[PDB]
Amino acid sequence: PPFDLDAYLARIGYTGPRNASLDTLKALHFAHPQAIPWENIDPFLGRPVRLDLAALQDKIVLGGRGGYCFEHNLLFMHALKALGFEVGGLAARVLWGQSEAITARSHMLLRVELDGRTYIADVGFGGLTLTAPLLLEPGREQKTPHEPFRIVEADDHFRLQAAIGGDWRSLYRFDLQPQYEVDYSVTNYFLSTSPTSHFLSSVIAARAAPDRRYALRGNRLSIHHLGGRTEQTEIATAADLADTLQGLLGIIIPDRTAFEAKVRETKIVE
């Protein structure tokens, strides 16, 4: 089908100018991850994740659900293309929370060419969602609506890093090789279905807000206040987990019974 830009902008609550400016890119990059949560509900429930434009719009834009990295950034790319931006897909190997080896190119991000300069954009990283586009300028410290970020060079590739707890912490590493939807479909198949993929076995969710970030992993809820404390709470029951997801985090669980059942079966909570 075509992309319904009005419907997407409605989903994310964007009523600003429709053009291919840096101002617009910034506004969209902030609004999207506040409106659409990061979640792995479908992979966890063993439901297929479809990346074609029709299915993304129906799941996320019309159906009011969220998704993980490919869903977020494919949708975001479609929207930016509709607005007249020059945008391409990239891939990355995740470094955040891993152990120091080479991980699979399991993450999607975007490249945006704007007023003669290269930016990256990424509204789909689960560990810490970026809320502004970043100039691809190695070393430079860049303010965002949340944490500062920087891109550094390493060998013949780049790392994206965030300033967290007074340290520069690597999120992921990438090069500028272009990626297409077909490339993402292979990785998506692996992450959504492989017995080795943790996206099948854990509940992982996040949503940005103006002054904070909510992050959930299993029965642990973290609320990170901007330039402030992080509240940590342990979620006691499968029912409470579902309630936290659906209330606080704005996540829709299509089959709550099967969800709670799996949470109990797999011992995610007590």
**Which residues are marked as active site?**
69, 107, 122
| 147 appears as a binding residue in the annotation | yes
- Cα 22 from Cα 188, distance rounded (Å): 30
| 70 appears as a binding residue in the annotation | no
User: Are 29 and 121 spatial neighbours (Cβ–Cβ below 8 Å)?
Assistant: yes
Sign of CA dihedral 49, 51, 54, 58: positive
| 69 appears as a binding residue in the annotation | yes
Amino acid at 11: R
| 127 appears as a binding residue in the annotation | yes
- Cα 181 from Cα 107, distance rounded (Å): 13
Q: Is 164 exposed, middle or buried (0-12, 13-18, 19+ CB in 10 A)?
A: middle
| 168 appears as a binding residue in the annotation | no
- Cα 38 from Cα 215, distance rounded (Å): 9
| 198 appears as a binding residue in the annotation | no
- Cα 178 from Cα 68, distance rounded (Å): 20
Place of tokens 């997801």: 245
| Closest listed residue to residue 226, CA positions, set 243, 208, 244, 253 | 208
- Cα 67 from Cα 73, distance rounded (Å): 10
Please give the annotated binding residues for CoA, written as ranges: 69, 96, 125, 127, 147, 224
Annotated binding residues, written as ranges, equal 69, 96, 125, 127, 147, 224
